[PDB]
Each structure stands twice: as structure tokens, then as C-alpha cells.
């Protein structure tokens, strides 16, 4: 749990695993403390992994028998925040808007406080992210020196019907209903991306600096969750056909938030709370 990355430099590693069956979330956090004699600041690389269940559900609408609903994650939320004035968020990955099916990036470190969030010469330490986001797009929703938040949202779909936007109210609505079971007014699982039928496996990185001797502890709040949309499929007769309608941002910030405290001196980590 201690890796030597060079003369006067080492990485002290800690991990925290925290799950919520209520939110359907697992936070697998890697806390890599960068101890370097040539770097005048405390530094910590946080690798945010785990799982966010999609919580996709299908149900009959009110007292009807012609209207069926699909409650699905329009977006996944991944957020990190500190309330410490002595901490600075110095880099994070992914930085830019990315629609690639797979997101794989590397953070590099070179002795003397040199971080290369660009991916010449080798690194003293590296950390890699890797996640799949088929039909979704990743982009930073918010950033400042104390926080970063990504949105991984429904983007572009090709179902059995054609090329659709993640905002299109007809998205996931079936052409013909299979039965009166509410699932059956919506496209089968092989027409659904994994982020809709199963969930998201996040892989995000953030690096923070801390002014040495300004305080031994800092709190970090990490949030993992979803913004749920509701798609209604209405059976009509022209023999039966389905017409789609959407309640966009039906349930926002359905998130599991965990508060962590790091000790810069002892490299120890506690969980202070969660919802």
C-alpha cells in the first residue's frame, strides 16, 4: 500500500468501498497520496469507480390500461466537492465532452508537482480511467477549484427504427405492443444500451493539492446518481400502435452522497456520513 515512485517520492494508497442498496450505488474510491520532497504541496489523486444501477422500471399509468410508463436514467451524475479553502482541484479526467463508446484516459505524474492530464518522456506514476457509455455522452456539468461534476447523458440512438436523439419523446417506445405487461410497450433489452438496461460503471479521476501545514484534515463529498425521465407509451387504434411522450427531468439528483475525511499527515481516511 506504499509504492516508491522515485528518490524522495512515494504514493501511499488507501481505498474506500461504500454501497447503498436504497440508491442502488457502489462507490469504490482509490485515494493515492503523492508524497514528494520536490513538491511543496500535499497532493491526492482520487479515482472514482464503482456502479450505479440504472433503476429502469416499467409500470401501468394510473387507473388506465392503454398507457404504460418506463422510468429510465436520462443522465448519470458523478460529483466531487470539498469545502476546504486550503484544497485546490488541479486536474480531472475526462476533461472534455466525449461521445466515444469507451472512455480510456491516463493521468501522469512527474516528480516536482508535474501532472500530465494530456493523455515527452516517462512518468513517475500514472493512473488510468476506463468506462463504457454506449449511446451516452460525457461532459463536465460544473467545475471550480473545489469541485467537479460530470453528466453522462442519453445522446444518440439507433434502435430498430432509426437514428434518434436522447431528447426525442419517441425514444424506447415500441412500434407494436407485445402484451399488457408494462415492459411490452417498450423496446426489448437487445435494443437498449447497457446504461439503460443495467447501469453505469464510472471511472473518473480528480487530483487535489493541499497547502502543507494549513490543517491536517479535509472533507470531500462524492455524489453518484441519476436524473430519471419518464417515457409514456399510449396505445391507440388506427391495428393498435404506440405514441410516445416524455416527462424530461422527472426525478433529478437521485444520488448517493458520501462525505469522506482525509488526514494529510497520517494518510488515513474516514467516512463521516452518507444519505
Author numbering: 3 to 121, 126 to 244, 248 to 284
From the primary publication:
With the exception of α-hemolysin, which is homo-heptameric, leukotoxins are bipartite toxins, formed by the non-covalent association of two distinct proteins, a class S and a class F component of approximately 31 and 34 kDa, respectively, into a likely octameric species. Panton-Valentine leukocidin (PVL) is associated with necrotizing skin infections, such as boils, and plays an important role in the poor prognosis of necrotizing pneumonia. Two additional structural domains are also found: the rim domain anchors the protein to the membrane surface, while the stem domain, closely apposed to the core β-sandwich in the soluble form, contributes two β-strands to the pore β-barrel. Since the binding of LukS-PV to the membrane is a saturable process, the necessary presence of a LukS-PV receptor on the cell surface was thus proposed. This was recently confirmed by Spaan et al. who showed that the C5a receptor is required for the binding of LukS-PV to human neutrophils.
The mutants exhibiting significantly decreased binding abilities with respect to wild-type LukS-PV were: R73A, Y184A, T244A, H245A, and Y250A, with Ki values ranging from 1.8 to 6.2 nM, i.e. a 69- to 238-fold increase compared to the Ki value of wild-type LukS-PV. Four LukS-PV mutants (R73A, Y184A, T244A, and Y250) displayed significant alterations for all measured parameters, i.e. at least 50-fold decrease in affinity for hPMN membranes, 2-fold decrease in the slope of Ca2+ influx and 2- to 10-fold reduction in pore-forming capacity. Crystals of the Y184A mutant were obtained at a lower pH 6.50, but the conditions were otherwise identical. The latter belonged to the P41212 space group with cell parameters a = 104.86 Å and c = 106.87 Å, 1 molecule per asymmetric unit, and diffracted up to 2.33 Å. In the case of the rim domain, wild-type LukS-PV and mutants T244A, Y246A and N248A displayed only small differences, with r.m.s. deviations comprised between 0.20 Å and 0.30 Å, whereas the structure of the rim domain of the Y184A and Y250A mutants were markedly different, with r.m.s. deviations of 1.10 Å and 1.28 Å, respectively, when compared to the wild-type LukS-PV structure. Other significant variations in the conformation of the rim domain were only found in the structure of the Y184A mutant, where residues V179–Q186 were affected, as well as in the conformation of the Y250A mutant, where two loops (V179–Q186 and R241–A250) showed structural variations. As the result of the Y184A mutation, the hydrogen bond found in the wild-type LukS-PV structure between Y184OH and S249OG was lost, and the loop was reorganized with a displacement of 6.0 Å for the CA atom at position 184. For both Y184A and Y250A mutants, crystallization was achieved in different conditions than those for wild-type LukS-PV and the other mutants, resulting in a different crystal packing.
